[PDB]
């Protein structure tokens, strides 16, 4: 679009004191016409940034100056204490009256919930070169995180469930590819791609270039999700469509935490019970943990309290300073965010989805602003909490068991180092192991008599630590529906007649009811894919076979070939699916 005249205007503007981007036009002709195609392209690139960032590149640079000055100082709050509105969730593995009440109320609320998945990252830091949502939740079925979230959402919210996936330049095309390949049909899905922002080569906010001579770009953070939604349309605003359709809540989830499908119904139920406009999903926190703390804050002695996440790195600094004169007192936020939709939209409309920003440069050496790598401005999706004043809104946190938090974020190497420090591994191995264990704890809670050893069955990361997998029991969304305890009880109506040996594998797909079963081995039971069809009922079943086993990937891993994939290598073991009985119909 941009005219030759506007590009010249921007070029000159960027050369003025306070912006000082003269280095960009190093060795250029005096007018636009005289400029070549590269040059005209770089200027156009600077120009079009206006349709991507408030105030375009000039304002980006000013914001940079302001933030670089800010982060050179010592962050600190005048006041910091426990959030007033904190609520304890009942255990996920005890079927009490309260848990039943919360799950059923929360599950009803899922019918009027909008879901948002932030998935703008690759899993390279894990040793995985593909998109994180293509990681399998477990390798028994190999169900991807993407399919896991979407099928659950379509199960609890119906086929036409409103669903947003935020992607980035890194993940976007592969996300679309995965959607297509999995044959997922989600009529009201919106894939919204965040744009990358320019980078600063130095502490004076001079823009960085790559080797090609083009402007360097990096992600602006998960904070982008709110503005992407604010600007999205179907042509009325996206959120208008949701409100008018009767939707009442909106939930934000991250890319590799399968626990969200359990915590969410409870958070919704509690949000309603306690009239919460924003509800942070939390867990008891360990002092050495890369998750934020939910705190009541007063930035300056003048301001009103604000309930907000204080990122781990920042609380590592504020903590160490001042006071007015075995977990953290304050909850750890896992970034499953639950909102009342009307309140969310109000704040969204007011802010245009813009949340406070920050910059966090990595320095070449200890104490001079020579960047090790170019820095850019970032934002966090949870910082939208800062737009909810205590006067007008109720922002709180729900505390769940730590076990319900199951992210896959660390490589095997990192996990080994973390485990040595007594910290959580949060790697692919413990993610998969935790998923299987979660199913077992949920099933035992409704009376399924599962007897199994607590000992690890395989060791990973050079014998650093072990996990166990068996017994493996995976029920799909047609079988288990929402996964509530009541829903599980529909699959096992007489659980005391179901005897699954500790070494067994049970995979259930479609409309299945298991009344009685003795299983010593691996079994797949399939029923109708239609949730409304007549169930396949299993009675007096006895199945014995060699079943499955698991073993570690050996250190002697070089080879012309092997069928080990990155997916295998990042968890350090492989299931051997030796035998399998199938009961169809
Ligand atoms: O530009 C981006 C960057 C990320 N994400 C996505 O954002 C999500 C998180 O990214 P993360 O796991 O890399 O780590 P964080 O440490 O930043 O996030 C913490 O997570 C844990 C605590 O709650 C803590 O308070 C909370 O802030 C992923 O799904 C990404 O795909 C995007 O969609 N775009």
From TrEMBL:
Its cofactor is Mg(2+); Mn(2+). The keyword Nucleotidyltransferase applies. The keyword Kinase does not apply. Keywords: Nucleotidyltransferase, Transferase. Its EC number is 2.7.7.64. Pfam families: UDPGP (PF01704). It catalyses: a monosaccharide 1-phosphate + UTP + H(+) = a UDP-monosaccharide + diphosphate. UTP binds at residues 118, 120, 132, 194, 255. UDP-alpha-D-glucose binds at residues 118, 120-121, 194, 221-222, 254-255, 292, 311-312, 333, 382, 405, 409. UDP-alpha-D-galactose binds at residues 118, 120-121, 194, 221-222, 254-255, 292, 311, 333, 382, 409. One of its GO terms (molecular function) is UTP-monosaccharide-1-phosphate uridylyltransferase activity. PANTHER family: UDP- GLUCOSE PYROPHOSPHORYLASE, UDP-SUGAR PYROPHOSPHORYLASE. Belongs to the USP family. This is UTP-monosaccharide-1-phosphate uridylyltransferase. It comes from Leishmania major.
């Amino acid at each position: 679009n941009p005219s030759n005249s506007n590009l010249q205007a921007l070029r000159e503007e960027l050369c003025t004191p306070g912006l000082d981007q003269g280095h960009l036009f190093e060795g250029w002709p005096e007018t636009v016409d005289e400029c070549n195609e590269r040059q005209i392209a770089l200027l156009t690139d600077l120009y079009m940034f206006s349709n991507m960032y408030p105030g375009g590149v000039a304002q980006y640079i000013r914001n940079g100056h302001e933030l670089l000055a800010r982060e050179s100082e010592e962050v600190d709050f005048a006041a910091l204490e426990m959030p007033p509105l904190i609520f304890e969730a009942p255990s996920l593995h005890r079927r009490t009256a309260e848990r039943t009440a919360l799950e059923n109320a929360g599950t009803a609320m899922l019918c009027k919930t909008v879901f948002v998945l932030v998935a703008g990252g690759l899993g390279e830091r894990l040793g995985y070169s593909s998109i994180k949502v293509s990681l399998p939740v477990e390798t028994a079925t190999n169900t991807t995180y993407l399919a896991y979230y979407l099928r659950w959402a379509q199960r609890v919210g119906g086929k036409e469930v409103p669903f947003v996936i935020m992607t980035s330049d890194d993940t976007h095309d592969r996300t679309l590819q995965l959607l297509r390949e999995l044959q997922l049909e989600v009529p009201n899905l919106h894939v919204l791609k965040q744009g990358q922002v320019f980078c600063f080569a130095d502490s004076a906010a001079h823009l960085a270039l790559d080797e090609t001579g083009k402007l360097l770009r990096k992600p602006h953070g998960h904070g982008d999700v709110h503005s992407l939604i604010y600007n999205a349309t179907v042509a009325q605003p996206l959120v208008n469509d949701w409100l008018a359709a009767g939707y009442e809540s909106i939930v934000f989830i991250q890319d590799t935490n399968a626990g969200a499908t359990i915590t969410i119904p409870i958070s919704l139920a509690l949000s309603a019970e306690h009239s919460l406009d924003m509800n942070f999903t939390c867990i008891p926190r360990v002092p050495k943990e890369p998750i934020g703390l939910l705190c009541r804050t007063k930035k300056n002695s003048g301001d009103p309290w604000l309930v907000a996440n204080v990122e781990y790195n920042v609380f590592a600094e504020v903590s160490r300073a001042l006071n007015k004169d075995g977990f953290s007192p304050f909850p750890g936020s896992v970034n499953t965010l639950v909102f009342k939709l009307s309140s969310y939209v109000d704040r969204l409309r007011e802010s245009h989805g813009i949340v406070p920003e920050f910059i966090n440069p990595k320095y070449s050496d200890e104490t001079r602003r020579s960047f090790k790598k170019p820095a850019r401005i970032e934002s966090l999706m949870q910082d939208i909490a800062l737009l909810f004043s205590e006067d007008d809104y109720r922002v709180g946190g729900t505390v769940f068991e730590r076990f319900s938090y199951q992210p896959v974020k660390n490589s095997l190497e990192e996990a080994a180092g973390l485990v040595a420090q007594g910290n959580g591994a949060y790697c692919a191995a413990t993610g998969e192991a935790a998923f299987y264990e979660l199913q077992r704890r949920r099933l035992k809670a409704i009376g399924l008599p599962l007897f199994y050893s607590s000992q690890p069955e395989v060791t990973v990361a050079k014998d650093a630590f072990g996990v166990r997998l068996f017994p493996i029991i995976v029920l799909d969304t047609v079988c288990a529906s929402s996964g509530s305890l009541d829903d599980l009880a529909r699959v096992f109506p007489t659980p005391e007649k179901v005897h699954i040996d500790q070494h067994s594998t049970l995979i259930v797909e479609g409309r299945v009811i298991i009344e009685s079963l003795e299983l010593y081995g691996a079994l797949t039971i399939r029923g109708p894919t239609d949730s409304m069809a007549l169930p396949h009922v299993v009675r007096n079943a006895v199945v014995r076979n060699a079943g499955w086993s698991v073993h570690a990937i050996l250190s002697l891993c070089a080879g012309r070939d092997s069928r080990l994939s990155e997916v295998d290598r990042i968890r350090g073991f492989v299931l051997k699916k030796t035998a399998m009985a199938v009961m169809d119909c």
